[PDB]
Amino acid sequence: LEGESLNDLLALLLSEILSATNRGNVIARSISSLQANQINWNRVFNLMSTKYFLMPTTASLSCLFAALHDGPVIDEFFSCDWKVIFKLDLAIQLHKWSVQNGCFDLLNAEGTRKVSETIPNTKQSLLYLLSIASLNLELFLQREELSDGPMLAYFQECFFEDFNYAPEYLILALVKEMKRFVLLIENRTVIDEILITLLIQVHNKSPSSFKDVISTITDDSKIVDAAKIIINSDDAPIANFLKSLLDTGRLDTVINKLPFNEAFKILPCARQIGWEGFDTFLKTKVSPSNVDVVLESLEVQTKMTDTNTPFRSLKTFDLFAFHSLIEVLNKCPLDVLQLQRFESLEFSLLIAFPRLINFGFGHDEAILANGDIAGINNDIEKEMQNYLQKMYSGELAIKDVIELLRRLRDSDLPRDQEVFTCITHAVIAESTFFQDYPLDALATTSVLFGSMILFQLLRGFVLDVAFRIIMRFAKEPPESKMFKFAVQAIYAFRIRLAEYPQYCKDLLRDVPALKSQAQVYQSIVEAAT
Amino acid sequence: LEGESLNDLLALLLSEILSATNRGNVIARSISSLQANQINWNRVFNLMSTKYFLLMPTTASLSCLFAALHDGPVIDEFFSCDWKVIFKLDLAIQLHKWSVQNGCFDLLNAEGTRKVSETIPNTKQSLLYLLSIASLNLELFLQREELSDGPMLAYFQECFFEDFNYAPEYLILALVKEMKRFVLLIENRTVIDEILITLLIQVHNKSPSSFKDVISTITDDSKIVDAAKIIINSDDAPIANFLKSLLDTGRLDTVINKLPFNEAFKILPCARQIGWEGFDTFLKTKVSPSNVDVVLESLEVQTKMTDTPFRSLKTFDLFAFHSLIEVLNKCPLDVLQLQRFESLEFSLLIAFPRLINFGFGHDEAILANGDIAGINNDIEKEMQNYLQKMYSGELAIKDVIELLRRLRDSDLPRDQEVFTCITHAVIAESTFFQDYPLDALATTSVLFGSMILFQLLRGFVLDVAFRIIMRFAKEPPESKMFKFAVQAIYAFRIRLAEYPQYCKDLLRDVPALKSQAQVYQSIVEAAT
Ligand SMILES: [Au+]
Ligand SMILES: [Au+]
Ligand SMILES: [Au+]
Ligand SMILES: [Au+]
Ligand SMILES: [Au+]
Ligand SMILES: [Au+]
Ligand SMILES: [Au+]
Ligand SMILES: [Au+]
Ligand SMILES: [Au+]
Ligand SMILES: [Au+]
Ligand SMILES: [Au+]
Ligand SMILES: [Au+]
Ligand SMILES: [Au+]
Ligand SMILES: [Au+]
Ligand SMILES: [Au+]
Ligand SMILES: [Au+]
Ligand SMILES: [Au+]
Ligand SMILES: [Au+]
Ligand SMILES: [Au+]
Ligand SMILES: [Au+]
Ligand SMILES: [Au+]
Ligand SMILES: [Au+]
Ligand SMILES: [Au+]
Ligand SMILES: [Au+]
Ligand SMILES: [Au+]
Ligand SMILES: [Au+]
Ligand SMILES: [Au+]
Ligand SMILES: [Au+]
């Protein structure tokens, strides 16, 4: 039997849906006896649709698929336009599929369309089959336009399960078939929103697929929308995610297109990952309208300790970044409170990340060879300590230490540059305690500090720190350890006072008590030039 | 001139204590030319203090008096003499303003002065290194309240606060060394104790490198413990060196046991990491149902911690965790405490996967992979591909089970690691079974069950597995979790007989089992 007469195996399949066992299987086996490509199945299926009957279960469908047997035929069965109730039923019954109880093995039917031609089906999900994935998406996107039965809700539990088990397949299908779904719903932003939920969800469950999903998406509006949510939602670490954006070349776009201050949050980990659009980011993005964000961030990074915070390498800038940030920050037009906060921060920053001190004079390779924020080894701390106390015990002259530091500041040997860092840092951090010092130790420290300013061992921002400290002590009551320290330090660098007339005018303005310190006062007023 | 009439250089020294530039250190140079040991100086100073003032010397004049005396023993002799209080006060105050660079007598280089230690060097270049001066200050300050309040007392007090910040190690060394004398002076144990504890805490904050040394000299552990109780609560972490200092001086075990509980528990991981050695006995002795909410809380927190910093110091090693589980299931837990604890065994094995096969005689192997470190990527990847092969047809479940059974008893670290990884992966994946397609779910169900059957899951981990299977079994029939419980239970049915209590529970609490004929049969068969 052939042709349109033959096409009434439509009836065979139709009853093989209708409720049978004994004869059902010989029916499927008999239809399978056919050469499928020489049958016009469109006719058969549309025939089933048109003249309706004379709800399938997994057993029945299983025999329908056994009858059809060929992946292209099965796909054809799916693409036929069924009553929504039947499609809902079909999807629901496939969610209950098991080969182990003897259902037809669809996953092994050759020539079905896949949600991906690259990604293998590791999840072992029927949603790998594009027909099925798209069935589910098609039903789900239409949720509201459908009758609410028991089956609607049941399907919703099914899809929620699918959404948890294999969202990568759901999203690969949503993209591969996107024209269709946009045209079906006739609302692009519903497709967009569902797309973003999916993307976020592929990140949460099964991140090993994320890159692969990202690959197939063009509009980066979506990826940014998703990244924005992933950022605030997740507690850290997000590294793999950022590395997947980098590896697919979407990361820079996300950092720049993300709202500011979410971007800034993730800037340190982006760098450890290899991002390297940072200085451009600073130049373009950093404005006086957002600076308070930057200050908040850096303050926080200084308060972090390797034992207070989970990662900190990925939460803290490297020396190069901190450096760049300091430069730009003293360049931006900060208001008064913002500048007080910033200067405060430069001190907190120098205390927190001491390798910053000598950074940016062209010895950086040597500096960085000791680590960025890692913290100084105990033997260098101990050596620096021995050196210093030996100065305080009279054995070494101040100018000896000064000579040493002056050698080390220009050294390319990492341990050198490190010892420099430790010594200078030590003095500066120790500045909070000068007011408790006996007068001899205080005088020695005062001359050491001052000479550090004289011989140019403190430069850049570190020198402004120094100057602000000296100023801050100068503003303390005279005859006080702090005031005596200010005075002696200033005297100790006096030969170079000529280079900072502004500073001298500020000392003269704001420290009247200087009028009682003869030699120094004279030196400072001579800085009217 | 000799004798008592010589002892009337009381007059000379007395004049130097009064304010010219020229004459003063001529007098000084003259007096110093004498041989110091031959003079009876006690008599001299006594005379100086009795027919006396013809009060409040200048720093220049004091420097002159020291230049006159020159000798450490003589100088000490000058300090010990009992002078008026206003003089003692002016004396401490002028010493606080000492400068050798401004030309003051160099007191620190005088030979044969009494120090605060004969061991510790004067690294701080403090006059408080000299026991006479340290003690002078302690003496004045301990008497704050009972002394007339002038401007001198206030001045001095501010000096002492500077000393308190600069060199507390010297003040406390001196307080202990002369402890008898100060006890006699105050006659209040609580004042000496308050000051001692305060000093000790202060040595910890500034100059911690001195702490161990200070701690050596103290016999009473009561104060060390008090101080440590303050230090623990006040500081945010880390305390490592501090505890190490207590261990090296043998006060650590004492402090852990004499500290209030729950502070003590907080510092237990770091203590062990340092080498403490008393954890066993601590658990056995101190853990009571009134304090277990603290143990539970601390353990939960440890589970939720992510590498909450570098956590090595905040987190127990595997041996401690194991011990804690053992002890906790032996304690009379409340209902809520029970829920919590079991939930905790799960969260625990999720967070510390090397716990799984721990304590069966393979621990060295396990521990060679790290304690809490986290499984290497090569292992996760290998393990993943392996398991996958099982889920798509290639490997039979009994193959995986055979392998695991092999690795369970292995002393090779990596075998034990792979085991940890596969088993942990299945269990951690348990939260997601309700999303599994039926075939994958069935395979996992049989794998899990067989894990129970062939004794891959033992001890507390077995109790976890059973609690999971049970919890899934209470879910409505035809639901995925229920089908999972059923298939798992079925897959170990042969060993059901080994667990009558479990079977009876299954029979009482899960009526729906009566609908799976095979399994129901086996369970009542195993009900004895
Ligand atoms: Au035929
Ligand atoms: Au046939
Ligand atoms: Au079939
Ligand atoms: Au079936
Ligand atoms: Au959804
Ligand atoms: Au990822
Ligand atoms: Au798109
Ligand atoms: Au982060
Ligand atoms: Au990172
Ligand atoms: Au700009
Ligand atoms: Au602003
Ligand atoms: Au020099
Ligand atoms: Au330092
Ligand atoms: Au500052
Ligand atoms: Au003289
Ligand atoms: Au003579
Ligand atoms: Au004099
Ligand atoms: Au003097
Ligand atoms: Au005090
Ligand atoms: Au004592
Ligand atoms: Au701690
Ligand atoms: Au210490
Ligand atoms: Au520790
Ligand atoms: Au208990
Ligand atoms: Au009890
Ligand atoms: Au963990
Ligand atoms: Au694993
Ligand atoms: Au099942």
Supply the DSSP string of A353-388, one letter for each residue. Answer: -GGGTTTTSS-HHHHHTT-SSS---HHHHHHHHHHH
Distance from the CA of A30 to the center of ligand 2, in angstroms?
A: 4
Task: State phi, psi for A49 to the nearest 5 degrees.
Answer: -60, -55
Q: How far apart are CA A179 and CA A188, in angstroms?
A: 10
Strand pairing partners for B130? B115
Q: How far apart are CA A210 and CA A200, in angstroms?
A: 9
> What does DSSP assign to residue A114?
B
Residue A385's nearest CA partner among A357, A418, A423 is A423
Helix (H, G, I), strand (E, B) or coil at B433: helix
Does the beta carbon of A389 lie under 8 angstroms from any beta carbon of chain B? Answer: yes
> Burial of A505 by CB count in 10 Å (0-12 exposed, 13-18 middle, 19+ buried)?
middle
Residue A353's nearest CA partner among A338, A373, A336, A327 is A373
Q: How far apart are CA B527 and CA B507, in angstroms?
A: 9
> Considering only alpha carbons, which residue of chain B is nearest residue A108?
B392
Find the ligand nearest to B1 CA: 16
Using CA atoms, how far residue A503 sits from A331, A336, A477, A500, in Å, is 19, 18, 19, 5
Using CA atoms, how far residue B12 sits from A272, B9, B34, B70, in Å, is 76, 5, 14, 15
Burial A233-268 (b: 16+ CB within 10 A, else e): eeeeebeebbbbbbebebbbbbbebbebeebbbbbb
Tokens 């000392």 map to which residue?
A507
Cβ-based contacts of A435 with chain B (< 8 Å): 162
Q: Is-contact A84 A44, C-beta < 8 A?
A: no
User: What token pair was written down for B70?
Assistant: 């020159």
Dihedral over alpha carbons B441, B443, B449, B454 (to 10 degrees): -160
CA quadruple A43, A45, A48, A50: dihedral sign: negative
Per the CB < 8 Å rule, is B165 touching A308? Answer: no
CA quadruple B112, B118, B124, B128: dihedral sign: negative
Residue B450's nearest CA partner among B507, B390, B506 is B390
> Considering only alpha carbons, which residue of chain A is nearest residue B306?
A310
Other C-beta atoms closer than 10 Å to the C-beta of B427 total: 21
CA angle B202, B203, B205 (to 5 degrees): 60
Q: How far apart are CA B12 and CA B41, in angstroms?
A: 13
Cβ-based contacts of B236 with chain A (< 8 Å): 308
> Burial of A86 by CB count in 10 Å (0-12 exposed, 13-18 middle, 19+ buried)?
middle
Question: How far is the alpha carbon of B393 from chain A, nearest alpha carbon, in Å?
Answer: 11
In chain B, DSSP finds a helix count (H) and a strand count (E) of 30, 0
Q: How far apart are CA A367 and CA A358, in angstroms?
A: 8
Per the CB < 8 Å rule, is B125 touching A98? Answer: no
The pairs formed by A425-433 with CB atoms below 8 angstroms and a separation of 24 or more are: A425/A350, A425/A351, A425/A354, A425/A357, A425/A376, A426/A384, A426/A385, A426/A388, A427/A452, A428/A350, A428/A351, A428/A462, A428/A465, A428/A466, A428/A469, A429/A351, A429/A354, A431/A469, A433/B165, A433/B166, A433/B206
Does the beta carbon of B391 lie under 8 angstroms from any beta carbon of chain A? Answer: yes
Per the CB < 8 Å rule, is A310 touching B306? Answer: yes
In chain A, DSSP finds a helix count (H) and a strand count (E) of 30, 0
B323 CA to centre of own chain: 20
> Considering only alpha carbons, which residue of chain A is nearest residue B238?
A307
Q: Gap positions in chain A, given as the residue before each gap (C–N > 2.5 A)?
A: 19, 54
Dihedral over alpha carbons A374, A233, A348, A460 (to 10 degrees): 80
Helices (H), A378-438: 378-392, 398-408, 414-430
> What does DSSP assign to residue A477?
P
Question: How far is the alpha carbon of A158 from chain B, nearest alpha carbon, in Å?
Answer: 9
CA quadruple B98, B100, B101, B103: dihedral sign: positive
Tokens 């068969």 map to which residue?
B525
Using CA atoms, how far residue A507 sits from A100, A339, A483, in Å, is 88, 19, 12
Q: Is-contact A424 A458, C-beta < 8 A?
A: yes
Does the beta carbon of A100 lie under 8 angstroms from any beta carbon of chain B? Answer: yes
Strand pairing partners for A114? A129
Amino acid occupying residue B178: E
Which of A122, A205, A441 lies at the smallest CB-CB distance from B388?
Answer: A122
Q: How far apart are CA A231 and CA A233, in angstroms?
A: 6
User: What token pair was written down for B312?
Assistant: 């090595």
Cβ-based contacts of A392 with chain B (< 8 Å): 125
Other C-beta atoms closer than 10 Å to the C-beta of A405 total: 21
Distance from the CA of B316 to the center of ligand 12, in angstroms?
A: 52
Q: How far apart are CA B19 and CA A173, in angstroms?
A: 100
Q: Which helix (H) or strand (E) holds B424?
A: helix B413-428
Amino acid occupying residue B370: G
Please name the residues in contact with B411: beta carbons below 8 A apart, sequence gap of 6 or more. Answer: B362, B364, B365
> Burial of A495 by CB count in 10 Å (0-12 exposed, 13-18 middle, 19+ buried)?
exposed
Please name the residues in contact with A484: beta carbons below 8 A apart, sequence gap of 6 or more. Answer: A439, A442, A443, A446
Q: Is-contact A36 A69, C-beta < 8 A?
A: yes
Does the beta carbon of B98 lie under 8 angstroms from any beta carbon of chain A? Answer: yes
Pick the residue of B435, B444, B479, B483 with the most A CBs within 10 A to test the interface with A by mutation: B435
Structural domain tally of chain A?
A: 1
Task: State phi, psi for B374 to the nearest 5 degrees.
Answer: 100, 140
Does the beta carbon of B389 lie under 8 angstroms from any beta carbon of chain A? Answer: no
Please name the residues in contact with A269: beta carbons below 8 A apart, sequence gap of 6 or more. Answer: A236, A237, A238, A239, A242, A314, A315
Pick the residue of B109, B125, B431 with the most A CBs within 10 A to test the interface with A by mutation: B125
How were these coordinates obtained?
A: X-ray
Does the beta carbon of A165 lie under 8 angstroms from any beta carbon of chain B? Answer: yes
Cβ-based contacts of B388 with chain A (< 8 Å): 122
Q: In Å, what resolution does this model reach?
A: 2.8
Find the ligand nearest to B421 CA: 27
List of E strands, A234-360: none
Question: Whole domain around residue B443: which residue ranges?
Answer: 1-528
User: What token pair was written down for A129?
Assistant: 């089959």
